[PDB]
């Protein structure tokens, strides 16, 4: 059986091809002690680093889909194979994922590590948005995947990708967390350390939602208090947040909140459709597929429906497809792809890698 | 029973001899993917290529009645026999059509393919304008056939053709479509790709008409807006066109609009009549038969009537015969001819082709 | 004296008729602050917007030769007359330029602004490729003008234009800049904002060249490092690019690199010649005139020479005329035309415009 | 004339707009007797509390730029207006200051007290780092202000602020004083009470300096005794300190000395520049403006110059601007701003406050 | 086997590593005759000085954890090795203890005496609060150790110490004894000499307790006499004390009783927890470990539980761990540490001390 590992900027999703859900889902963090030991491990990975985060400095080795710390990324892969899956890497072909429009050296160095450090028999690097379309059981649609580091649009029609219409935005979940940390100081709550950033991320996942009409929601939160909710910190302190609940996800539709010049995810989706041939736009309008953890905000599908309907012609039928399991769509699609009998010819074996060099990994890639 | 296949520059009309209408009518196009497949057929033909045209490059293998791409033309014949008619070619004699004054190698290579690739028992290549006269139930008349690639005049008197009065013009429907694409840029509408050319062709067939008086119509369209009509694009966008509706078909009467030096179809018809013997001109004036898709514009028979009346003597009775089914006149006439008991001696059998070479196909031909 | 203003998609070229070079050459941009002022002008134009681009959102009011933002285009004309030329518009007749096959409303609204906002005494809108032939001192030749927004071919023979052989391609310098931004992400360089697009444009103008043989050049850049060059960013960072230097201009000859279906500039030039009368093709083959900033790549004349020689008959003499000042050929030709005594009758005066309406501006136009 | 009051965490700087220096500079402390009176005022403020600190418990009402004790903060404002300036608050508009990223209720409650307790005619709360740029006579630069409670970086370019690049660190002078108290116990000196903390603060301001190379300085202080200096306590005891002189200010560059996870002021300045647009970084590198009392250590400008030069590209010109009067830069800039004729429209009058509520005070604020 | 010597300000605890209790526990006093001998030893140490205290002046060589009289401290170490343990110092490695935040010269001079006067083979100076956590069998908790001279809080999480949250208070048992001597004069009991201070210390250890509610206890002692207890002096006189029983230990929670400005041990514990990372506070709240003789008052754990519960959030579980043997926790923990096989590498041998100087003793120290 094959291994399917979706190495996100925020979460590692790993498991075996053929399963319906990832077996191991843990944060993609490496923690190191920042104080002084007197009574000890040198570094902690994943959920272990999360439970000891009070005395650790937490580091993400992947920033915006790009692996920045290769020594820490190797610890995460080692932790995934031996501690989470309890499997031998040299026995299973490994399907990895990557964001589109990544640097070419990122995929080449990832292939060298899988072949020379873990000695996998074969491997393959897929494009994440293509796997998301496999998970939804579709051959046509424009995928909006938004994770912790990358937001990208990839239109696909009848199984053919349109690489020249691919959009990529370096605004995702981690940028929303940093923005929530900033606007929480308006109420006197100060989250500074990397461990406290994990607390704000948990606040974001529990209380934040997307307002259908932002300016109408801002007036409601300013008049009454029915939108305010409480949250208990790990030390028992209770904080209360009001309009911060929908101001944080609003950055997805107004990236100028964090000083970015780019357009929101609704305009980016519409611009990607308008770059496609006029004869496929009707099918793309009816098959907007959302995937990734950042699409899990309550009300984001209704907001995307409203914003794209206002941009598209009135006779087009806009349909946002947001299944409940879309947070793992990339992994689920990779599990379906790695189980296809037609796919078994696309594995890049160790023998082919020794005779073709690193350039063999850049095929069917964009 | 015999097969009747009218392979036009734009449409394939195929069916069985004895029927009243073609069984299979589909565009004579071959489409190939122009992007990149990630999730597939290599090429699509006819209506299948039309429905997937958003991700295809569309190619017409026939240009101006002349087969240019023989590999693609073979795919269209294969698609016609096995996908559209669901018939075995080696069981039916096949009546094919051709425009007059075509290159001799076009008919010879078409005969070699029918005998050696499809192994038809017998075949025959008829002249299209002669079949149009069969469809109208006439033995005398001058036929003006205008399709997608060729416009030609053929006078026939009491069953005798006058080959030396045959006119041929390489201005037809596809040239009007390209001209409509050009003058639509005046309103800011940009159709460039081969898939968008199919959209303009649909605009032409829905909204374009022939003005009875062109300069009087240009003044009306410049003064008011009663001639403007809207059209909804496949993606929901609505375009509005005014004088482009009658400027496009006006090219048939003023070929200088597209830079051609030739005379319009009315002058070409009159010149063909004036090259005929003076004793048959009265019968030709009263039997102007129009056929083909490009004669389907509203008001073209009234315009032809007016233009030829102004050229002919005042005592001649000009009569334009334009039946409602004239878009399939060539096929209907070929269905009548292939069902005649007198015609059964004109079949070129496979045995006669092996003993006489390709030169046997050039009999009763011009 | 007359004003000659070449309003390109990328650069404004303005000056006085009779001069040898434009007096004012500045980018056709309008910048507006995108942050928040605390210590201010509302908008900046041209070189002023270029020097402050770090805190501005830069907007081009002309896209593909078509004016899209008329309020911003009016700011550019105002900046041209009063800040760059320091002249009174109501004292000089103004010769403007336009790309062929533009929407008719573009030229009409441009005439209304010049007569009612700036109150010019007279004006005239010339066709750019015709002016390029004036600059080269020729009466016969096929002009390939490629600027920031439009690439077009216009054949002219003995002073007569052939409008039905005019080609227009919406692929020019700005599309090459966007493609260079895309393929620079392969090396981990991320240019996203409109200000960073100006940096990539500067990279393109300094380092990009046209390879004589593309596939042979790709093998050289993949084997060694002699083609790699460094470039210092405004903040002191040094980037290094290799095959991106010739992959970006290769899009001119292979528009499928950016997903366009059209043919390259060499095939478009050859197709335009083949649409012309056979008796003028020999003179067009020997007078290929290149103009515009996008024809300034090193090696593009040698590549065009090689590609057209491979398409034309072996006995034809292909000659590419590429003078060193061809980046301003449209302006230089407009300066020659506006100084001709024969041209002084073609000025459209304010009095003629009030009595003939906007339709007077569509004369000698295509 | 207007009042300019810079209420710092450590010092109150108050005076009149138009002057060159604050008229009243006193510690922002409230002292209350902690023993028992037998022979009396209930509380002492400022320099009076400083001279009687032996029998007082000293309290700072402002912690890390945030007013914590509003009853004590009201005593300080009352002491400022009536005892230090000898002025009537209801006759002068008052310009107050605040650190960026403060809680919103801090500025709202400060406005309510100025309007309802002191009945000022108008008021305005400025951002401190913006005023520091006014004092230096610049429109572009990144300000590093470090006082007693807050250290913050604010980049400004051509008069436009970049709020999304603003850094704030809760490490300043009071944290260095507490760290000096801790490391003085290594030599057997025990400072515990709030009155003795004022003695350590005086030691810090007299003897502490920033080492150019910390590890090289630690080796010199460990080998000889040329770095040791003596200090006479208020009771005549003489203490001698060696490497504590530069270990205390080193916390600014290594916040891990006091257990903070954040980066030093040099890395924070460089990170703030790298978050800004690439086109403004060159101007920010050349205009590093330092302000506040914590930037008054000898050798801190040379150390900042060295640390940022090691982080920035080698071709950038790093220039630290540290004027001798930078300890009062916020007040001096507020004195310049309150004297501008353009600023007289930004006063928030008492009438506007009664009709717009407390929300009017959050304009041009971050 | 190793020697474990806990040299407190009040008691010497000495024994061998591996044992469960100290073998020698005696007061850390040196007594010298203060009258005139007529019928004799020059000085007495420990229990011998205690039994002859009537004719001696008693001196403590350690004040507030700091060795003040080095000649007398050497007599105590000599008495410990040769009279109490009857052991040869040059045969056993010696584990010594020290309070945190002590002067550096205290530990250096103690190391020089152990190596040059007693010629121990190896030695090590541990931090007392860390040893207290070893004794309780915990890896996480905040230790409140209160002896005769020093009270300090040290939080430890999962074996990692947080030195920047360490509190130290120079208020312990000897200050409570001096306060009891003062308030006993209210009943006419006069204890003045150093020998009578030992009697008051015995009164404190027998009769003093911590009141759960101080003001409610003061009302009970003022209304009735059920809280009064008698104590027989060495000469047969019987004294009776009432509210002095709980007023003396109340100084631990209200240090202002003896004129100290610091906060009580409950506020100091809570402040130390609040300086720690928010993610470890829940574990520190549940693991408050008390050690030392001054934590042996009846009712001090219930009072600490009540005071910290009133400061902490209501959802936190406050748990005070006070084992019955906590008066020797530092020694018991040092006996466990010196018996660990992992610790045998941390011994500072005499050879390492001769080659590294006194600076080797400051490792893993704060
Ligand atoms: N219920 C939720 N609501 C909002 N955001 C969520 C939710 N669950 C997860 N996220 C966000 O999704 C991001 C990561 O999701 P994922 O798609 O796994 O990203 P990646 O694949 O890049 O690691 C995190 O930043 C997290 O904050
Ligand atoms: N209703 C219509 N009005 C105008 N043109 C039409 C109409 N229907 C078909 N056509 C044109 O007729 C042309 C093809 O007709 P046809 O006679 O089948 O040509 P061919 O036989 O050469 O394929 C096409 O170019 C199409 O645009
Ligand atoms: N040396 C050069 N090499 C390549 N491209 C260039 C060079 N100089 C200018 N260009 C390109 O030419 C384009 C604009 O030239 P121009 O002919 O003025 O266009 P327009 O007239 O449409 O404004 C710009 O996109 C610019 O990038
Ligand atoms: N010469 C000096 N050297 C070092 N630190 C100084 C000096 N003078 C003042 N300080 C420190 O500056 C801090 C306060 O300066 P200031 O900028 O007024 O802060 P705030 O505005 O927050 O009150 C105090 O903590 C003080 O210790
Ligand atoms: N039962 C008790 N109740 C109250 N205090 C006690 C009791 N037993 C001992 N003490 C006090 O504990 C102090 C010394 O204990 P210890 O922890 O050994 O201190 P050190 O280690 O500093 O010598 C003495 O001041 C003594 O008065
Ligand atoms: F890396 Be995640 F998918 F943004
Ligand atoms: F080929 Be069609 F009949 F013009
Ligand atoms: F507008 Be440029 F001439 F392409
Ligand atoms: F409050 Be100070 F300016 F740090
Ligand atoms: F010296 Be004791 F432990 F207070
Ligand atoms: Mg992902
Ligand atoms: Mg036909
Ligand atoms: Mg141009
Ligand atoms: Mg300040
Ligand atoms: Mg002790």
What does this structure look like?
- The structure is a homopentamer of 366-residue chains.
- Chain A has helices at residues 47-51, 70-84, 104-116, 128-135, 173-184, 194-207, 214-223, 244-250, 265-274, 281-285, 300-311, 329-337, 350-356; strands at 3-7, 11-16, 24-27, 30-33, 36-37, 44-45, 56-59, 62-63, 66-67, 94-98, 122-127, 141-146, 151-157, 160-161, 167-169, 229-232, 238-241, 288-291, 320-321, 348-349.
- The first copy, chain A, has 366 residues and is of the alpha+beta class.
- Chain A folds into four domains: 1-29 and 62-125 and 328-362, ATPase, nucleotide binding domain (Nucleotidyltransferase, domain 5, 2-Layer Sandwich), CATH 3.30.420; 30-59, Actin, Chain A, domain 2 (Roll); 127-172 and 262-323, ATPase, nucleotide binding domain (Nucleotidyltransferase, domain 5, 2-Layer Sandwich); 173-258, ATPase, substrate binding domain, subdomain 4 (Actin, Chain A, domain 4, Alpha-Beta Complex).
- In chain A, strands 3-2-1-10-11-20 form a six-stranded mixed β-sheet, with helices on both faces.
- In chain A, strand 13 and strand 14 form a beta hairpin.
- The longest helix of chain A has 15 residues, at 70-84.
- Chain A is flat and about 70 Å long.
- The interface between A and E is medium-sized, with 22 and 29 residues.
- The complex binds adenosine-5'-diphosphate (5 copies), beryllium trifluoride ion (5 copies) and magnesium ion (5 copies).
- One magnesium ion (MG) binds next to loops of chain C.
């Amino acid at each position: 059986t094959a291994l399917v590992c979706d190495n996100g900027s925020g979460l590692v999703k790993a498991g075996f091809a053929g399963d319906d859900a990832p077996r191991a889902v843990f944060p993609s963090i490496v923690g190191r002690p920042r104080h002084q030991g007197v009574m000890q491990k040198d570094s902690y990975v994943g959920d272990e680093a999360q439970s000891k985060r009070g005395i650790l400095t937490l580091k993400y080795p992947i920033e915006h889909g790009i692996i920045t710390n290769w020594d820490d990324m190797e610890k995460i892969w080692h932790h995934t194979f031996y501690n989470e899956l309890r499997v031998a890497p040299e026995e299973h072909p490994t399907l990895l994922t990557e964001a589109p429009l990544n640097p070419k050296a990122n995929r080449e160095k990832m292939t060298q590590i899988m072949f020379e450090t873990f000695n996998v028999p074969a491997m393959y690097v897929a494009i994440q948005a293509v796997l998301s379309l496999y998970a939804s059981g579709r051959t046509t649609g424009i995928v909006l995947d938004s994770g912790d580091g990358v937001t990208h649009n990839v239109p696909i029609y009848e199984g053919y990708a349109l690489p020249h219409a691919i959009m990529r935005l370096d605004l995702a979940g981690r940028d929303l967390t940093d923005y929530l940390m900033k606007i929480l100081t308006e109420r006197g709550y100060s989250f500074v350390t990397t461990a406290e950033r994990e607390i704000v991320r948990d606040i974001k996942e529990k209380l934040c939602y997307v307002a259908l009409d932002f300016e109408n929601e801002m007036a409601t939160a300013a008049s009454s208090s029915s939108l305010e909710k409480s949250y208990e910190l790990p030390d028992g302190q209770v904080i209360t947040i009001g309009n911060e609940r929908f101001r944080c996800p609003e950055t997805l539709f107004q990236p100028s909140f964090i000083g970015m010049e780019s357009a929101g995810i609704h305009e980016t989706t519409y611009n990607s459709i308008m770059k496609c041939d006029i004869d496929i736009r009707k099918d793309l309008y009816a098959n907007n597929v959302m995937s990734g953890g950042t699409t899990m905000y309550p009300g984001i599908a209704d907001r995307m429906q409203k914003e794209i309907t206002a941009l598209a012609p009135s006779t087009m039928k806009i349909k946002i497809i947001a299944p409940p399991e879309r947070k793992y769509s990339v992994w689920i699609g990779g599990s379906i792809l790695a189980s296809l009998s037609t796919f078994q010819q696309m594995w890049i074996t160790k023998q082919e890698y020794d005779e073709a060099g690193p350039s063999i990994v850049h095929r069917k890639c964009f």
